[PDB]
Amino acid sequence: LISEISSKSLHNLLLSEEMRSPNVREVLYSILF
């Protein structure tokens, strides 16, 4: 866990730019399966 916090601070999520629901994510994962 030495570099895990550095990985946390590194990741670039500041711009979302997506613009649903978690059950929709469930069926998307099942469909991908």
Binding site: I2, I5, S6, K8, S9, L10, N12
Partner: protein, 164 residues
């Protein structure tokens, strides 16, 4: 704060590299060396940041360990004096029971302040986690991304220059 200032000096040297490779058509590998110098200096400074962070969390976790070990010692004393009180109740020495219950009261008062110092340590290590990670490494990552985007922009500019 001085970490950001020194990396700002490094990226100002990188701006000088950009200037010289823009004026007299300098080698792009010079810009690569400049960006890699910013990279390795940011890396070693972030290593220094985690070195200081690990040093003081080791210090404060060692103090917290010492204090909970001492709390274990004090509750061991409480258990020992409680057993002495239980065995003394079968004898009938009331003059020593008052001293023993006062000894229990004082150790309970000490144990309360032990827990207070535990709570003081925990919030302090939490704040040390929050502030340093929220400012230092984030600012270094931001200036790294700004410098690599500037280098990419100039390299694509030189790509346009060479293709014309």
């Amino acid at each position: 704060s001085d970490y950001t200032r020194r990396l700002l000096e490094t990226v100002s040297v990188l701006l000088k590299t950009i200037e010289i490779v823009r004026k007299e058509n300098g080698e792009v590998a010079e810009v690569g060396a400049a960006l890699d110098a910013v990279k390795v200096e940011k890396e070693k400074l972030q290593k220094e940041i985690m070195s200081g962070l690990y040093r003081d969390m080791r210090r404060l976790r060692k103090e917290r360990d010492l204090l909970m070990k001492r709390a274990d010692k004090i509750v061991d004393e409480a258990l020992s004096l409680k057993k002495q009180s239980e065995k003394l109740l079968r004898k009938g020495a009331r003059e020593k029971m008052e001293k023993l219950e006062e000894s229990v009261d004082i150790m309970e008062s000490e144990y309360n302040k032990i827990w207070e110092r535990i709570d003081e340590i925990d919030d302090i290590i939490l704040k040390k986690e929050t502030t340093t990670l929220s400012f230092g490494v984030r600012e270094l990552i931001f200036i790294e991304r700004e410098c690599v985007e500037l280098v990419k922009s100039f390299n694509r500019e030189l790509n346009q220059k060479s293709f014309e």
